[PDB]
Design a protein around this ligand. Structure first.
Ligand SMILES: Cc1nccn1Cc1cn(CC[C@H](NC(=O)/C=N/O)c2ccccc2)nn1
Ligand SMILES: *[C@@H]1O[C@H](CO[C@@H]2O[C@@H](C)[C@@H](O)[C@@H](O)[C@@H]2O)[C@@H](O)[C@H](O)[C@H]1NC(C)=O
Ligand SMILES: *[C@@H]1O[C@H](CO[C@@H]2O[C@@H](C)[C@@H](O)[C@@H](O)[C@@H]2O)[C@@H](O)[C@H](O)[C@H]1NC(C)=O
Ligand SMILES: *[C@@H]1O[C@H](CO)[C@@H](O)[C@H](O)[C@H]1NC(C)=O
Ligand SMILES: *[C@@H]1O[C@H](CO)[C@@H](O)[C@H](O)[C@H]1NC(C)=O
Ligand SMILES: *[C@@H]1O[C@H](CO)[C@@H](O)[C@H](O)[C@H]1NC(C)=O
Length: 526
């Protein structure tokens, strides 16, 4: 019940799940807290301790702005942090099966949130189900987000960038040294994450410093080649002094600017984060990954194209309606409380919100490819198109392109297309299979029959959990026991993927081919 780690001794707690027991270690620190002088830089090695650490409750979430656009609405507040915010937040969690396993495959989860939000404490990231059903060990960590974690003056150790990525990486190192004492196999470690977390997974594939810290990778609705995924160094530094003039920390010795930024309380840093870009976006990564030259040594699209990444198996996938979630965060004519039927001109106004610094002809190119309807007169035409426009551009096509380029270098890749709409999804029905609402199925939440999910969702979650675990343990996401569809490798020629839903899991080819060619061949030119 008490585990001796290579820097201290931690105590956990027992949980009863499905007539069994899971040992949970909540909130274990993996770094000296990045407070005071340590704010904005790479995490430092946590030094030894003497007590028995009582890791029996989620630790603090990292500082972050909160989605306040729907106060009291579970669809929005589900994602807001559910522990205290604090700069002292570099902690992790461990779920081990009871009784303690011997050489268990370890799953490391990295949450999403546009690199500005998110926390491991979330209800839909509970790894107790996974530990019980599949007797894998589940780990998740808190990493700094927003400017406190991704402010960048490139070169400057006082603020080099990618600190939150380096946070993640130090947690992977902690698993390498300590997960053996928990009965886990450091030689069988699968990273998985969602959206921004999924982009981080793909970045750990490029980053040499992480190659020795995991074996395989799963990417859910995200990859680094997504337009929101990596910030330039041009706009990065523009974004730091814009934050310095907003805080009155404009100096000219870049190190002395940082010292000024450290005696500002976290709330003032959070407040100015928004106004740092002139024309924001529902998907505006104001402070995100950069080519720091330390974690990310080159422009990631070049590393990808030229095969400069860890060779291993990936599992990639997207949801049917990735885009809809963002339409009600600014797009005109949209709301979560009506059918959101928009017209042609509400659509065109919606493009300017999602593509603000894009030419007039560029906006017209998007309109021409998505408003040549399979047929006119349907009232949802413009509503559905703009959802797809945001989905195809920001998630679906970059994930597909990432998978093709990765597979061309000879590794097994598996692609899925999640198209089940949760029967408990709070948002309306026109928003479809929303971005983020496969996570509960991955973590096995429909397995708790007390949780209001239908039987079919329990079956679908049960198979997904099996497929995910098999991929983690054996590199192949099959469900061999029940007479279920086999999941084929994604080859760059045939481009086979598997659909996931309650009815049928069918095998199809070349997902969103016409739409994705537009986004990946002729739109990057504008
Ligand atoms: C982790 C996750 N998985 C599925 C969904 N989510 C959360 C989420 C949030 N938003 C739009 C609002 C935006 N947050 C982002 O995370 C941007 N990403 O690009 C934001 C910025 C600052 C302050 C409050 C909110 N859309 N989904
Ligand atoms: C850490 O926890 C120790 C034991 O906690 C208590 O006993 C266990 C078996 C559970 O029943 C738990 O809910 C109880 O609170 C304490 O004796 C010790 O003081 C704690 N240390 C610190 C620093 O909080
Ligand atoms: C860089 O930032 C410049 C300043 O932006 C303006 O001032 C900041 C403090 C914010 O309030 C912002 O909303 C304002 O627009 C921009 O004028 C400039 O376009 C940015 N980009 C470049 C490449 O210089
Ligand atoms: C766990 O499996 C790895 C696989 O190579 C092996 O090298 C290691 O010795 C095993 N350890 C235990 C404790 O079973
Ligand atoms: C900036 O200030 C720091 C701290 O005073 C100093 O070490 C450094 O040399 C300065 N750089 C320049 C270019 O003046
Ligand atoms: C396989 O089907 C049985 C019923 O025949 C069910 O109880 C079990 O949970 C299923 N397993 C998986 C992994 O889907």
């Amino acid at each position: 019940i008490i585990i001796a780690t290579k820097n201290g001794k931690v105590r956990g707690m027992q949980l009863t799940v499905f007539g069994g027991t899971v040992t949970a270690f909540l909130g274990i620190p993996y770094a000296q807290p990045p407070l005071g002088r340590l704010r904005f830089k790479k995490p430092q090695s946590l030094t030894k301790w003497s007590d028995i650490w009582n890791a029996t409750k989620y630790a603090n979430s990292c500082c972050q702005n909160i989605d306040q656009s729907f106060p009291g609405f579970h669809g929005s507040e589900m994602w807001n942090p559910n522990t205290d915010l604090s700069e002292d937040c570099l902690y992790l969690n461990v779920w081990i099966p009871a009784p303690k396993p011997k050489n268990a495959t370890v799953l490391i989860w990295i949450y999403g949130g546009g690199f500005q939000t998110g926390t491991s404490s979330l209800h839909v990231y509970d790894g107790k189900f996974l530990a019980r059903v599949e007797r894998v060990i589940v780990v998740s960590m808190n990493y700094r987000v927003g400017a406190l974690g991704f402010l960048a003056l490139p070169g400057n150790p006082e603020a080099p960038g990618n600190m939150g990525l380096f946070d993640q990486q130090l947690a992977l190192q902690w698993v390498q040294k300590n997960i053996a004492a928990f009965g886990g196999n450091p030689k069988s470690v699968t990273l998985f994450g969602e959206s921004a977390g999924a982009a981080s997974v793909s970045l750990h594939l490029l980053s040499p410093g992480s190659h020795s810290l995991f074996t395989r990778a799963i990417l859910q609705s995200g990859s680094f080649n997504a337009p929101w995924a990596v910030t330039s160094l041009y706009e990065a530094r523009n974004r730091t002094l814009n934050l310095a003039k907003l805080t009155g920390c404009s100096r000219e010795n870049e190190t002395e600017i940082i010292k000024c930024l450290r005696n500002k309380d976290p709330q003032e840093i959070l407040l100015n984060e928004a106004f740092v870009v002139p024309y924001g976006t529902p998907l505006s990564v104001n402070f995100g990954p950069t080519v720091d030259g330390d974690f990310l040594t080159d422009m990631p699209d070049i590393l990808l194209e030229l095969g400069q990444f860890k060779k291993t198996q990936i599992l990639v996938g997207v949801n049917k309606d990735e885009g809809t979630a963002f339409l009600v965060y600014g797009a005109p004519g949209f709301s979560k409380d009506n059918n959101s039927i928009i017209t042609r001109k509400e659509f065109q106004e919606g493009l300017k919100i999602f593509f603000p610094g894009v030419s007039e002809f560029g906006k017209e190119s998007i309109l021409f490819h998505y408003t040549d309807w399979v047929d006119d007169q349907r009232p949802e035409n413009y509503r559905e198109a703009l959802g797809d426009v945001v989905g195809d551009y920001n998630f679906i096509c970059p994930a597909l392109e990432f998978t093709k380029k990765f597979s061309e270098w000879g590794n097994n890749a598996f692609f899925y297309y999640f198209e089940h709409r949760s029967s408990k999804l709070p948002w309306p029905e026109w928003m479809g299979v929303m971005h983020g609402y496969e996570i509960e199925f991955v973590f096995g939440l429909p397995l708790e029959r007390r949780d209001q999910y239908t039987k079919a969702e329990e079956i679908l979650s049960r198979s997904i959990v099996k497929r995910w675990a098999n991929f983690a343990k054996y590199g192949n996401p099959q469900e061999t026991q029940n007479q279920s569809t086999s999941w084929p490798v994604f080859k760059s020629t045939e481009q086979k993927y598997l659909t996931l839903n309650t009815e049928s899991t069918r095998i199809m080819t070349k997902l969103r081919a016409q739409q994705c060619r537009f986004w990946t061949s002729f739109f990057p030119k504008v």
